[PDB]
């Protein structure tokens, strides 16, 4: 049992410095297997980076030249990766796995980080209810993720989320669930919506009107 | 540096069928540098079967694969409901590692219309100089749907943003929404809003429409 | 299912050193087992004594518990198949032959049909429905390659479905590649419900994590067994950490290995194996094994029996079936038969090179050259003989040893089988070589003559074929065999035939020898036939050839069919004797 | 771990430091595309395939190989082009397969050896000095004085003859140490010891070259270089210890407790099961031998990160160790002293003339066709099995050149007379005594020397034969073709006169004839036999009146120059290969 | 010509450590064995160890393994010995020398070099105290003591040198770090109690000079 | 190791004559040892290579041979130059060993020392110290020991002895016993006393030494 766990700045803006992090449990770093990292484009395409070997030799695939190294630090055991090319191309989620040296695969895996980069600047989101099926919008805010939830976990079933829709660097989420007109509108009901970005926590009762 | 390509890109099928998938090397690879991973939406790739027909612990013993040469295939002998999940094709044979592109399946159901519903701006947004018309359509399949959106008749395209889910993991059905941001000096000056819902479980649209300003 | 192989204790003396010294181990189905050691480490007669091959070579003092039950030494061979780590195989027959009748002899059972239907399946589970109906022949490039072959014979033990597998070093003279090969084969065999247990001489790195058991002996102690994870821990808590690159079977065999280079090295290295062996026995591995060797004593639940199902069809379905296999074998070799029918032919257009025509002037050599002939187709003929059973037999012979090891038949079973499949081309060969020498030298135009001429020769031919397998019955080396066998021919025409010493004035033990020398009777029927109606022409001291008959072997006409009789007891003769002597084969 | 002690040098290299270099090699069958170059000091070992057919990669780098031909690049030695000259003045092979003579001590069998390659001014003291030297330096002063024996199994171990076969070679004190398979039988703390002593012999100023196939994880620990190839195309050379950083710094790691040779071997393994891993495999290593290249590209070397003794002293040195080896192997001379006499005692009872009745005329020429006739049987195995288990020695003794065919033939076939006529006596005498031919000692002597010469054309021809032929049962067959083409031809059996010129022609050459007619011209010669009759006419009567008793003799020694001539021309022109 | 060449003489303190050195002339140096010798008065020799430059490989004396490390610079023929961890038993001459085999393993040493003394003690530079004896009352021996000096050569002689025999010298004795040296002369009766002599005493080491003239007395 | 033992350490021997210098081997040694030729002052010359090989440049006069591990150095019609140490030495197998060596002397007829005794002067008076000397010069052989008595005390501590070589004129041996006190130590006794005790006189030869 290996744990990998990546960890990172999430919204960072281009020509910086960007370090990501994974930290491994339950197996050190020094013994065997060949530890590396696998990026993932918002299309749904994986991408290996690179490796560094328990004796502390490197390898870097080519068409990604001289843009990063991969360094760790020993008795910690963290994992490193630095890519000064923090070009634009690069947002997207990355996770660190463990190569099985015998039959060069991938047995672990860790749980991922999304990465955005550009320059747009952080936003708070407005939230705006709908009903008259109820549910809410909340738009005009950068950067992801939003955790949308339901106040006491009311709507755990019957609903749907869209993924985001973004245009001029602000984007649109919009979460809709369907409950019959038997029990509503008595058994009230908020969209709780949660921003780690800025930290917002905005929860809005829905009303209908006629 | 070896290419791998993957064929069908998205497919479907019922529960029970045997389903087969393809990944083309661009050169030619050796047996033994051949891996399946399974990657489902919201967590990371999870190792699925390693040189070519060794099967992972934990995969539930369904699952083969065979190949050689630039040819190799996976092969599920009957589908179940776990199997919605997207395959990549790796390999090692020479340095750098790649992956293909993966190949997406999904679960076949009875067809399905959409509850479609259309809604008026908050109070929120009325206050604040702007506004946006949402039109959800609901729990359909397939997802090969068709939204009009018309203004007293006038279609309007341009500022409307629309998306869809993946395949719910509760019914099978696939749902969308679409947004049509206007300003308020236009969105008060008509009162006749209209979505037209076409798609291939019906005949003919099902219109619903907003008389509001 | 859980079947079980256990050893309470081995121990095992020859006669004085001892081989084996309280070898405990425990291996259930499912499992494989590697044993490792050095040269003297015995492990060789662990799978000897645990297969029964030794029969009574020394004393086993131990005690062997399958499915909870001992073993008698006499059940040994009904219970563990054995593999030997070097496969003869008849390079004439296909593999579909070969296991077709490995599995006639195996099993007693009719309905043709139903042996494809076994055969067929072991040549699905082994991968040989590939190279079936392909012939053996020689190396991979211009025939089966050597893994192929590794598998045939593995597949030739499957026929009589195995449930424990002893095998003997599988990969010795193959490559990496068709070593881990034959290694995954493995594995996958003992995979399917089956208990597999082998050794090996130098495993690879990659063969490590494979086997689900490793066990080391040295001079017949039994220093550690385990799995690799235990063999790890073990050997970590001892103080001896496995280094960086190392290979963890070349580093522990070196470290539980002695060196004879020199009296210190022996004394250190004994005093560090002693303290790693001293570490295993009171450990926690060691007690769980013999703990579940009891437990297995008195668990009344998985009672089971010998396997491989002991059918057995009598003498006579097996020298039939021995038969065809060595006909077919022979027939299939073009060259075997082109030599085996020519060479009596080559012999006499050789003699006949040399003497054109008798000439019947006694002064230009009427006498000498018949006697001549006579004496040089009586010593050439066993010769001939003999090159043909040197040539032939010893391939068969140990494919014999093999399998009459294996319990599918006796020695002198393949014995018989390859004295009577050589009859009838003795028989071609014999007239082969008469109807054209007789006639072109013109000895005797009358054709009864050509007829007694020819069974006189046939039986030489014969006699020295089946003296010569009698002797490789004993004596290892063909090339002794073939100057031995030689030289007897030579003595034997010296002695037993009066052309060159008259048999009346010799001393009598060389007339007591000379009755026994088939040459003596196959000389005086050759002089009857070809003296007696002759007159000569022409210091010439005959004139009549009846004078010539009475100056040598006098009264030999009237013994002539006699001598037919004693002259052809010669060839049952031997062919009892031959059954006595690969009897006595089968204690060597 | 093994063993640690002393790590002394006694016998170093005295000379300028040595270089070997290929560039661009290309050698089919072979081997691709090499290029290295080594120098005085290092160690290279080559692991891997490497080799090609009945040839390794070092026999190539000699320049003696077989089955194929260098198609282009370079070897230089010394900074000169690599030829016959320089590798004969240089280069030490030792093989991989090879005997020295089981019963002489290590002292003698260095002892000959040395007086066979060191030059002719040497004085005794200096050869002496130099046998001590190469003794102490491969650590055989202890059991220096044991028997080298092989066949004689009693005696040193398998890695003390392993030195020995190497000091055969450093006695004449190389340059360049050329070594294929030298762990090779020995057990693992042998074989670990005698790579350490491998080393020492590079760090006394020498160049050392090893193939090694399949290197355990303890011997791999211990090389300087290693040339990694998967077939001829090599995939890595440099420095043992790096290797892995190599592999992993390009995309292929290698798992802790892993040998790295056994896994890079492995994994660059050219598997030919089916075409479609044996085109994937081939592109694979293709692949790492032109990433190789470009890695070493820029960097030198591609390394990752005297009179001599004439031919009289050469066989006067023969012709001592082959007396000496011989004449102590007392198992083979009881056997053949005991198979010469039965043979001689059965044929003298089966023609006894003493206690009976006097041998007819027709049994007394029986009697002296069969002494005649009966003993090349025996001979002519003996001789052609002595010869062939002698090829080895023979062919790498003459292709490193340390003597030529002349001393040689001389020695070989001077040699056998001090076992030749003992034989002769035991075969003879009790055959002219237990059978009673003719009284006095001038016929006595003479029957003895018609045998003598007899046999010994015998033997020369039996020689000439297993020289001749590729292989030991085609030279049996030659020379049993021979032996029964001569016995047929005797004139005993069949008639001289009623011949058809071929076989008439054959007589001419029997030496089975002329024993023969001889030995009929010895007991018949002018004595008066009772059947009384004649003798000369009797001799006449068999067409045995011409050609005098000495003409006899001057035929049998013509025909036994003839078969000299034959093997003369035959181990000289045509290779005596092994087995 | 074959020649080797050594270093100087040498004085340190106990705990410190030297370098000496041997330069090769007139031949091949780099592939010859060369050998160090220690020579301590009051003993015989001892072999401390022999160098093959074009290897570096040192055969070692068990006894000099931890003492003694030997070395060589090729590109100047040049061999050194260190000797490190000095004590007062390693005052003594070290020698190198080369031998008859260019092979090295008989040790016959064809050439040697000139010796280098190394001293080892705690003293200090000094002046010596000069005495001379007095006869007392009664041929005549008279003579002089030379005592307390550090480092040694001391020359002394008598009568500025003129008395060319009749003289004995001792040889310094060691003794708390200092040396003791004295002479003696035998002088004729008509020269003593009469004619007069001088102890001339010079030591270069601690640049004095010290005449002592000795008259009749006691 | 294998030691090489030389026994008698001096050998008195007259020009002209015959030197024979012994060694033996503690083990095996199969002739290879080496003699060399050592004189004050100078580096070591190698005279023979393995046991009987003269090297070049040494005269015919030197000879060697040996049986066993028992070796022999000989000198024939012995020269002034050839008074010296000489050294036996193996190089069978390392460590090399040397032998603790021989020296010849030119033999002389006995003589008894001339002994004297010297009282300290007052220079060393006025520092403190003291010190009282006897010489014991052209004596013949070099075995003279030399003890110090004061007032009948026998004295260990506070002596030393310097000897000296065979003078190339004369012959003979010479020594100087020196005692160092301190001064209140020397005035506190009123007469000093040395005697040598040698091979030409079957009693010490004693000498004494008062003031006032």
């Given at each position: 049992?290996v744990?990998?766990?990546?960890?990172?700045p999430?919204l960072?803006?281009?020509?910086?410095?960007?370090?990501?992090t994974?930290?491994?449990?339950?197996?050190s770093?020094?013994?065997?297997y060949?530890?590396?990292?696998?990026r993932?484009?918002?299309?749904?395409?994986?991408?290996?980076?690179?490796?560094?070997?328990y004796?502390?030799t490197?390898?870097?695939?080519?068409?990604?030249?001289?843009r990063?190294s991969i360094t760790?630090?020993?008795s910690?055991?963290?994992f490193?990766?630095?890519?000064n090319?923090?070009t634009?191309?690069?947002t997207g989620?990355?996770f660190?796995?463990?190569?099985?040296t015998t039959?060069?695969?991938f047995?672990?895996?860790?749980?991922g980080?999304?990465l955005?980069?550009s320059?747009?600047?952080?936003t708070?989101?407005?939230?705006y209810?709908?009903?008259?099926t109820?549910?809410?919008?909340?738009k005009?805010?950068?950067?992801?993720?939003?955790?949308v939830?339901w106040?006491?976990?009311?709507?755990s079933?019957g609903?749907?989320?869209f993924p985001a829709?973004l245009?001029?660097?602000?984007?649109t989420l919009?979460s809709?669930?369907?409950?019959?007109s038997?029990?509503?509108p008595?058994?009230?009901?908020?969209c709780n919506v949660?921003?780690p970005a800025?930290?917002t926590?905005?929860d809005?009762?829905?009303?209908?009107?006629d | 540096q070896?290419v791998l390509t993957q064929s069908?890109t998205?497919?479907?099928?019922?529960?029970?069928?045997?389903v087969?998938?393809?990944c083309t090397?661009?050169?030619?690879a050796?047996?033994?540098?051949?891996?399946?991973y399974?990657?489902?939406?919201?967590?990371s790739?999870?190792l699925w079967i390693y040189?070519?027909?060794?099967?992972?612990?934990?995969?539930p013993?369904?699952?083969?694969g065979?190949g050689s040469?630039?040819?190799?295939?996976?092969?599920?002998?009957?589908?179940?409901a776990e199997?919605?999940?997207?395959?990549?094709?790796h390999?090692?044979?020479?340095?750098?590692?790649?992956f293909?592109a993966?190949?997406?399946?999904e679960?076949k159901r009875?067809?399905?219309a959409?509850?479609?519903?259309?809604?008026?701006?908050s109070?929120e947004q009325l206050?604040?100089?702007?506004?946006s018309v949402?039109c959800?359509?609901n729990?359909?399949?397939?997802?090969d749907?068709?939204?009009?959106?018309?203004?007293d008749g006038?279609?309007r395209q341009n500022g409307?943003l629309?998306?869809?889910?993946?395949?719910?993991?509760k019914?099978?059905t696939?749902s969308?929404?679409?947004?049509?941001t206007?300003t308020?000096?236009?969105?008060?000056?008509?009162?006749?809003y209209?979505c037209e819902?076409?798609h291939k479980?019906?005949?003919?649209?099902?219109?619903?429409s907003f008389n509001?300003? | 299912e859980?079947?079980?192989l256990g050893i309470?204790?081995?121990?095992?003396?020859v006669?004085?050193?001892?081989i084996?010294?309280?070898?405990?181990?425990?291996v259930?189905?499912?499992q494989?087992?590697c044993?490792?050691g050095?040269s003297?480490?015995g492990?060789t007669t662990?799978?000897?004594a645990m297969?029964?091959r030794?029969?009574?070579?020394?004393?086993f003092?131990?005690?062997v518990y399958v499915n909870?039950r001992a073993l008698?030494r006499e059940?040994?061979?009904?219970?563990f198949?054995?593999?030997?780590?070097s496969?003869?195989?008849?390079?004439?027959?296909?593999v579909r032959?070969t296991?077709h009748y490995?599995?006639?002899?195996?099993?007693?059972?009719?309905?043709?049909?139903?042996f494809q239907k076994?055969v067929?399946?072991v040549?699905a589970?082994?991968?040989?429905?590939h190279?079936?109906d392909?012939?053996?022949?020689?190396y991979?490039?211009?025939?089966?390659?050597?893994?192929?072959?590794?598998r045939?014979?593995?597949?030739?033990?499957?026929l009589?479905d195995?449930?424990?597998?002893?095998?003997?070093?599988?990969?010795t003279?193959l490559d990496?590649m068709?070593?881990n090969?034959?290694?995954?084969?493995?594995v996958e065999?003992?995979?399917?419900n089956?208990?597999?247990?082998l050794?090996i001489?130098?495993?690879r790195s990659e063969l490590?994590?494979l086997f689900?058991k490793?066990?080391?002996?040295?001079?017949?102690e039994?220093?550690?067994?385990?799995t690799?994870?235990e063999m790890?821990?073990?050997?970590?808590?001892?103080?001896?950490?496995?280094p960086?690159?190392?290979?963890?079977?070349d580093?522990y065999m070196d470290l539980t290995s002695?060196?004879?280079?020199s009296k210190?090295r022996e004394?250190?290295?004994?005093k560090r194996?002693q303290?790693?062996?001293?570490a295993y026995?009171?450990?926690?591995?060691?007690?769980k094994?013999?703990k579940?060797?009891?437990r297995?004593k008195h668990?009344?639940?998985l009672?089971?029996?010998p396997?491989?199902?002991?059918?057995?069809?009598?003498?006579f379905?097996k020298?039939g079936?021995?038969?065809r296999r060595?006909?077919?074998?022979?027939?299939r070799?073009?060259l075997?038969?082109?030599?085996r029918?020519?060479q009596?032919?080559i012999?006499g257009?050789f003699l006949?090179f040399?003497?054109?025509?008798?000439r019947?002037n006694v002064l230009?050599g009427?006498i000498?050259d018949r006697?001549?002939?006579?004496?040089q187709?009586?010593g050439?003929?066993?010769?001939?003989g003999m090159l043909?059973?040197v040539?032939?037999?010893?391939?068969?012979?140990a494919?014999?040893?093999?399998?009459?090891q294996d319990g599918?038949?006796?020695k002198?079973?393949?014995?018989?089988?390859?004295?009577?499949?050589?009859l009838?081309?003795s028989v071609?060969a014999?007239?082969?070589?008469?109807?054209?020498?007789?006639?072109?030298?013109?000895?005797?135009?009358?054709?009864?003559?050509f007829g007694?001429?020819?069974a006189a020769?046939?039986?030489p031919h014969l006699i020295?074929?089946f003296?010569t397998?009698?002797?490789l019955?004993?004596?290892?080396?063909?090339?002794i065999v073939?100057?031995?066998?030689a030289?007897?021919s030579?003595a034997?025409?010296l002695?037993?035939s009066?052309?060159?010493?008259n048999?009346?004035?010799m001393?009598?033990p060389f007339?007591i020898?000379?009755?026994?020398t088939?040459?003596?009777?196959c000389?005086?029927i050759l002089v009857?036939?070809?003296?007696?109606?002759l007159?000569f022409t022409?210091?010439?001291?005959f004139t009549?050839?009846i004078?010539?008959?009475?100056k040598?072997?006098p009264?030999?006409?009237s013994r002539?069919?006699?001598?037919?009789?004693?002259?052809?007891?010669f060839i049952?003769?031997?062919v009892?004797?031959?059954?006595v002597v690969?009897?006595?084969?089968?204690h060597? | 771990?093994?063993?640690?002690?002393?790590?002394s040098?006694?016998?170093?290299?005295?000379?300028?430091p040595?270089?070997?270099?290929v560039?661009?090699l290309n050698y089919?069958?072979g081997?691709?595309?090499?290029?290295?170059?080594?120098?005085?000091?290092?160690?290279?070992a080559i692991?891997?395939?490497?080799?090609?057919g009945?040839?390794?990669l070092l026999?190539?780098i000699?320049?003696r190989?077989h089955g194929?031909?260098?198609?282009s690049?370079?070897?230089?030695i010394?900074?000169?082009?690599?030829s016959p000259?320089?590798?004969?003045?240089?280069?030490?092979?030792?093989?991989?397969?090879?005997?020295?003579?089981?019963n002489?001590t290590?002292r003698?069998?260095?002892?000959?050896?040395?007086?066979?390659?060191?030059?002719r001014?040497?004085?005794?003291?200096?050869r002496?000095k130099?046998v001590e030297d190469?003794?102490?330096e491969?650590?055989l002063?202890?059991?220096?004085d044991?028997?080298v024996?092989?066949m004689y199994?009693?005696?040193?171990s398998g890695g003390?003859?392993?030195?020995?076969?190497?000091?055969?070679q450093l006695?004449?004190?190389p340059?360049?140490?050329?070594?294929?398979?030298?762990?090779?039988?020995?057990?693992?703390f042998?074989?670990?010891?005698?790579?350490?002593?491998?080393?020492r012999?590079?760090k006394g100023n020498?160049?050392?070259?090893i193939?090694?196939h399949?290197?355990?994880?303890?011997?791999?620990?211990?090389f300087?270089?290693?040339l990694?190839?998967?077939?001829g195309?090599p995939?890595?050379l440099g420095?043992?210890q790096?290797?892995?950083?190599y592999?992993?710094?390009?995309?292929?790691?290698?798992?802790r407790?892993?040998?790295?040779?056994?896994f890079?071997v492995?994994?660059?393994?050219?598997?030919?099961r089916?075409?479609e891993?044996?085109?994937?495999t081939?592109?694979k290593a293709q692949?790492?031998?032109a990433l190789?290249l470009?890695?070493?590209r820029?960097?030198?070397?591609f390394?990752?990160k005297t009179?001599?003794?004439?031919?009289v002293?050469?066989?006067?040195?023969?012709?001592?160790?082959?007396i000496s080896?011989?004449?102590?192997?007392l198992?083979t001379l009881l056997?053949?002293?005991?198979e010469?006499?039965?043979?001689?005692m059965?044929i003298?009872?089966l023609?006894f003339?003493?206690?009976?009745?006097?041998?007819?005329?027709?049994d007394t020429?029986?009697?002296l066709?069969?002494?005649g006739?009966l003993i090349?049987?025996?001979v002519i195995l003996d001789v052609?099995?002595?010869?062939?288990?002698?090829?080895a020695?023979?062919?790498?003794?003459?292709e490193?050149?340390?003597?030529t065919?002349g001393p040689?033939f001389?020695?070989?076939?001077?040699?056998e007379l001090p076992?030749?006529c003992?034989?002769?006596?035991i075969?003879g005498?009790?055959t002219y005594?237990?059978?009673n031919?003719?009284?006095?000692?001038?016929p006595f002597?003479?029957?003895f020397?018609?045998?003598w010469?007899?046999?010994?054309?015998?033997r020369?021809?039996?020689?000439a034969?297993?020289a001749?032929?590729p292989?030991?049962?085609?030279a049996?067959?030659?020379?049993n073709?021979?032996?029964?083409?001569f016995?047929?031809?005797g004139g005993?059996?069949?008639?001289?006169?009623?011949?058809?010129?071929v076989?008439?022609w054959?007589?001419?050459?029997?030496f089975?004839?002329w024993?023969?007619?001889?030995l009929?011209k010895?007991?018949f010669s002018?004595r008066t036999?009772k059947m009384?009759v004649?003798?000369?006419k009797?001799?006449s009567?068999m067409?045995?009146d011409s050609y005098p008793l000495y003409?006899?003799?001057?035929?049998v020694?013509?025909?036994?120059?003839?078969?000299?001539v034959?093997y003369?021309?035959s181990?000289?022109?045509?290779?005596?290969?092994?087995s | 010509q074959?020649?080797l060449?050594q270093?100087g003489?040498?004085?340190?303190?106990?705990?410190?450590?030297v370098?000496m050195?041997?330069?090769?002339?007139?031949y091949?140096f780099?592939?010859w064995?060369?050998?160090?010798?220690?020579?301590?008065?009051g003993?015989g020799?001892?072999?401390?160890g022999?160098?093959?430059?074009?290897?570096?490989?040192?055969?070692f004396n068990?006894?000099?393994?931890?003492?003694?490390?030997l070395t060589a610079?090729?590109s100047?023929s040049?061999?050194?010995?260190?000797?490190?961890?000095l004590?007062?038993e390693d005052?003594?001459?070290?020698?190198?020398?080369?031998?008859?085999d260019?092979?090295?393993?008989?040790?016959?040493?064809?050439?040697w070099?000139?010796?280098?003394?190394?001293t080892v003690?705690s003293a200090?530079t000094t002046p010596?105290?000069?005495?001379?004896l007095?006869p007392?009352?009664?041929?005549?021996?008279?003579?002089?003591?030379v005592?307390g000096?550090?480092?040694?050569?001391?020359?002394?002689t008598?009568?500025?040198?003129?008395?060319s025999s009749?003289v004995?010298?001792?040889?310094?004795?060691?003794?708390?770090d200092?040396?003791?040296?004295?002479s003696?002369?035998?002088?004729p009766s008509?020269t003593?109690?009469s004619?007069?002599?001088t102890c001339?005493?010079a030591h270069?080491?601690?640049?004095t000079?010290?005449?002592?003239?000795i008259v009749?007395?006691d | 190791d294998?030691?090489?033992?030389?026994?008698?350490?001096?050998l008195?021997?007259?020009?002209?004559?015959?030197?024979?210098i012994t060694?033996?081997a503690?083990?095996?040694?199969n002739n290879?040892?080496?003699w060399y030729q050592?004189?004050?002052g100078?580096?070591?010359?190698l005279?023979?290579?393995?046991?009987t090989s003269?090297?070049?440049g040494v005269?015919?006069?030197?000879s060697?041979?040996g049986?066993?591990?028992d070796?022999?150095?000989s000198?024939?019609?012995?020269?002034t130059?050839?008074?010296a140490?000489?050294?036996?030495?193996q190089?069978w197998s390392?460590?090399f060993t040397?032998?603790?060596?021989?020296?010849?002397?030119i033999?002389?007829?006995d003589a008894?020392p001339?002994v004297?005794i010297?009282?300290?002067?007052?220079?060393?008076?006025?520092?403190?110290?003291?010190?009282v000397?006897?010489f014991?010069?052209?004596?013949y052989?070099?075995?003279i020991?030399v003890?110090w008595?004061?007032?009948?005390?026998?004295r260990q501590?506070?002596?030393?002895?310097?000897?000296?070589?065979?003078?190339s004129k004369?012959?003979?041996?010479?020594?100087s016993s020196?005692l160092t006190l301190?001064?209140?130590?020397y005035?506190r006794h009123?007469?000093?006393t040395?005697?040598?005790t040698?091979?030409t006189?079957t009693?010490?030869?004693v000498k004494?030494?008062?003031?006032?």
């Open positions: 049992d744990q990998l766990q990546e960890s990172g999430g960072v803006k281009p020509s910086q410095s960007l370090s990501l994974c930290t491994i449990t339950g197996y770093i020094t013994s065997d060949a530890w590396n990292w696998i993932q484009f918002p299309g749904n395409k994986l991408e290996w980076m690179g490796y560094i070997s004796s502390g490197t390898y870097y695939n080519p068409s990604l030249k001289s990063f760790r630090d020993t910690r055991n963290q490193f990766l630095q890519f090319s923090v634009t191309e690069d989620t990355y660190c796995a463990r190569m099985i039959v060069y695969y047995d672990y895996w860790g749980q980080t999304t955005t980069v320059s747009a600047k952080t708070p989101p407005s939230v209810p709908l009903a008259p109820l549910g809410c919008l909340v005009g805010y950068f950067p992801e993720p939003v955790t939830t106040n006491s976990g009311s709507l079933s609903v749907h989320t829709v245009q001029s660097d602000l984007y919009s809709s669930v369907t409950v019959p038997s029990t509503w008595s058994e009230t009901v908020t949660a921003h800025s930290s926590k905005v809005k009762k829905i009303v209908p009107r | 070896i069908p998205i497919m479907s099928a019922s529960l029970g069928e045997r087969t998938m393809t090397a661009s050169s030619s050796s047996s033994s540098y051949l891996h399946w399974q990657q489902k939406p919201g967590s790739p999870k040189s070519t027909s060794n099967l992972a612990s934990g995969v013993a369904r699952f083969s065979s040469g630039t040819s190799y295939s996976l092969t599920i002998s009957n589908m179940e199997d919605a999940a997207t395959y990549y094709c390999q090692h044979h020479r340095s750098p590692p790649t293909g993966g190949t997406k399946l679960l009875a067809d399905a959409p509850t479609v519903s259309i809604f008026p701006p109070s206050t604040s100089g702007g506004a949402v959800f359509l729990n359909f399949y397939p997802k749907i068709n939204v009009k959106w018309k203004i006038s279609e409307v629309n998306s869809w889910t993946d395949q719910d993991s019914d099978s696939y969308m929404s679409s947004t049509a206007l308020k000096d236009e969105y008060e000056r008509h009162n006749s209209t819902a076409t479980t019906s005949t003919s649209p099902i219109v619903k509001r300003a | 859980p079947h079980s309470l204790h081995a121990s095992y003396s006669s004085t050193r001892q084996l010294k309280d070898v405990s181990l425990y259930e189905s499912g494989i087992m044993i490792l050095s003297g480490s492990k662990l799978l000897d297969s029964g030794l029969g009574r070579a020394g004393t003092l131990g005690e909870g008698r059940q040994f061979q009904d219970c198949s054995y593999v030997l780590q496969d003869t195989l008849l390079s004439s027959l296909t032959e296991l490995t599995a006639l002899l195996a099993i007693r059972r009719g309905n043709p049909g139903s076994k067929e399946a040549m589970e082994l991968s040989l429905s190279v079936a392909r012939l053996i022949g020689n991979s490039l211009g025939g089966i390659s050597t893994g192929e072959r590794r045939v014979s593995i597949a030739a033990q499957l009589q195995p449930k424990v597998m002893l095998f003997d070093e599988p990969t003279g990496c068709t070593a090969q034959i290694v995954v084969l493995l065999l003992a995979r399917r089956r208990i597999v247990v050794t001489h130098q495993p490590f994590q689900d490793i066990a080391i002996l040295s001079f017949g039994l220093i550690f067994c385990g690799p994870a790890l821990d073990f050997f970590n808590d001892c103080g001896y950490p496995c960086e690159h190392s290979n963890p079977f580093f002695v060196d004879t280079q210190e004394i250190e290295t004994s194996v303290m790693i062996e001293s026995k009171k450990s926690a591995i060691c007690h094994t013999l579940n060797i009891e297995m668990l009344k639940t009672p089971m029996v396997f491989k199902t002991k059918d057995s069809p009598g003498v379905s020298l079936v021995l038969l060595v006909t077919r074998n022979l027939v070799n073009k075997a038969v082109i030599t029918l020519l009596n032919l012999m257009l006949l040399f003497v054109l025509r008798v019947s230009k009427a000498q006697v001549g002939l006579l004496y187709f009586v050439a003929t066993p010769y001939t043909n059973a040539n032939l037999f010893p391939v068969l012979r494919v014999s040893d093999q399998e009459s599918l038949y006796q002198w079973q393949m014995m018989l089988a390859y004295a009577l499949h050589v009838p081309f071609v014999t007239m082969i070589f008469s109807s054209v020498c007789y006639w072109t030298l013109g000895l005797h135009p009358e054709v009864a003559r007694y001429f020819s020769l046939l039986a020295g074929e003296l397998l009698v002797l019955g004993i004596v290892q080396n063909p090339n073939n100057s031995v066998v030289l007897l030579i034997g025409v002695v037993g009066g052309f060159l010493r048999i009346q004035e001393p009598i007339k020898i000379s009755y026994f088939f040459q003596k009777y000389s005086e009857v036939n070809e003296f007696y109606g007159n022409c210091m010439c001291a009549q050839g004078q010539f008959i009475e040598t072997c009264g030999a006409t002539f069919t006699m001598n037919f009789l004693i002259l052809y007891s049952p003769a031997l009892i004797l031959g059954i690969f009897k006595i084969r089968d060597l | 771990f093994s063993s640690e002690s002393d790590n040098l006694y016998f170093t290299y005295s000379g300028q040595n270089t070997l270099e560039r661009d089919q069958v081997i691709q595309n090499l290029s290295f170059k080594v120098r005085s000091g290092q160690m290279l692991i891997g395939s490497s080799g090609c009945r040839a390794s026999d190539v000699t320049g190989g194929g031909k260098i198609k690049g370079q070897i230089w010394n900074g000169q082009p690599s000259q320089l590798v004969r003045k240089c280069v030490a092979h030792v093989r991989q397969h090879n005997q020295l003579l089981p002489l290590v003698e069998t260095l002892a000959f050896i040395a007086q066979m390659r060191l030059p001014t040497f004085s005794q003291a200096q002496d130099r190469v003794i102490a491969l650590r002063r202890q059991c220096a044991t028997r024996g092989n199994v009693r005696g040193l003390e003859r392993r030195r020995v076969s190497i000091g055969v006695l004449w004190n340059g360049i140490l050329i070594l294929d398979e030298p762990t090779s039988g020995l057990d693992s042998t074989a670990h010891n005698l790579v350490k002593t491998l080393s012999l590079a020498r160049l050392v070259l193939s090694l399949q290197p355990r994880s303890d011997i791999f620990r211990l300087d270089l290693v990694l190839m998967t077939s195309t995939i890595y420095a043992a790096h290797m892995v950083q592999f992993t710094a390009i995309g292929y790691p290698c798992p407790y892993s040998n790295p040779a056994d890079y492995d994994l660059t393994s050219i598997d030919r089916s075409r891993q044996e085109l994937a081939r592109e692949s790492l031998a190789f470009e890695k070493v820029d960097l030198d070397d390394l990752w009179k001599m003794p004439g031919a002293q050469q066989f006067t040195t023969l012709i001592r160790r082959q080896n011989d004449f102590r192997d198992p056997i053949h002293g005991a010469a006499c039965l043979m001689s059965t003298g009872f023609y003339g003493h206690g009976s009745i006097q041998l007819s005329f027709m020429a029986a009697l066709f069969m002494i006739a090349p049987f025996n052609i099995s002595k010869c062939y288990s002698e090829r020695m023979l062919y790498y003794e003459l490193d050149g340390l003597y065919t040689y001389f020695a070989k076939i001077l040699g076992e030749h003992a034989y002769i006596i075969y005498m009790p005594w237990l059978a031919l003719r009284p006095g000692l001038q002597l003479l029957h020397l018609l045998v010469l007899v046999v010994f054309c015998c020369i021809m039996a020689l034969a297993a001749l032929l292989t030991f049962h085609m049996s067959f030659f020379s073709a021979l032996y029964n083409s016995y047929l031809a005993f059996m069949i008639n001289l006169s009623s011949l058809w010129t076989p008439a054959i007589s001419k050459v029997s089975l004839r024993c023969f007619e001889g009929m010895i007991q002018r036999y009384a004649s003798g000369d009797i001799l009567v067409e045995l003409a006899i003799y001057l035929i020694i013509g025909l036994s120059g003839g078969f000299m034959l003369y021309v181990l000289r022109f045509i290779k005596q290969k092994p | 074959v020649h060449q270093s003489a040498e004085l340190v303190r106990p705990g410190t450590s370098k050195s041997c330069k090769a002339a007139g091949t780099t592939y064995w060369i050998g160090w010798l220690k020579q301590r008065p003993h020799l001892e072999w401390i022999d160098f093959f430059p074009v290897s570096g490989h040192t055969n068990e006894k000099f393994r931890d003492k003694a490390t610079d090729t100047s040049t061999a050194y010995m260190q000797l490190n961890s004590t007062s005052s003594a001459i070290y020698y190198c020398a080369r031998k008859q260019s092979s090295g393993p008989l040790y016959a040493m064809d050439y070099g000139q010796g280098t003394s190394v003690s200090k010596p105290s000069v005495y001379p007095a007392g009352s009664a041929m005549v021996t008279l003579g002089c003591l005592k000096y550090f480092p040694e050569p001391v020359t002394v008598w009568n500025s040198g003129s008395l009749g004995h010298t001792f040889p310094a004795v060691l003794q708390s200092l040396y003791t040296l004295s003696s002369v035998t002088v008509s003593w109690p004619e007069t002599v001339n005493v270069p080491a601690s640049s000079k010290v005449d002592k003239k009749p007395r | 294998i030691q090489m033992t030389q026994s008698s350490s001096y008195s021997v007259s020009l002209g004559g015959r030197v024979t060694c033996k503690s083990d095996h040694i290879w040892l080496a050592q004189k004050p100078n580096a070591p010359r005279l023979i290579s393995a046991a003269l090297e070049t005269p015919s006069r030197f060697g041979s049986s066993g591990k070796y022999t150095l000198i024939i019609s012995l020269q130059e050839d008074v140490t000489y050294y036996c030495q190089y390392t460590p040397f032998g603790s060596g021989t020296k010849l002397e033999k002389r007829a008894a001339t004297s010297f009282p300290p002067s007052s220079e060393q008076l006025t520092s403190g110290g003291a010190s000397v006897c014991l010069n052209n004596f052989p070099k075995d020991n003890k008595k004061i007032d009948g005390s026998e501590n506070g002596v030393l002895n310097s000897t000296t070589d065979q003078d004369d012959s003979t041996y010479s020594m020196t301190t001064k209140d130590e005035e009123n007469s000093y040395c005697e040598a040698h091979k006189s009693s010490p030869i004494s030494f008062n003031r006032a």
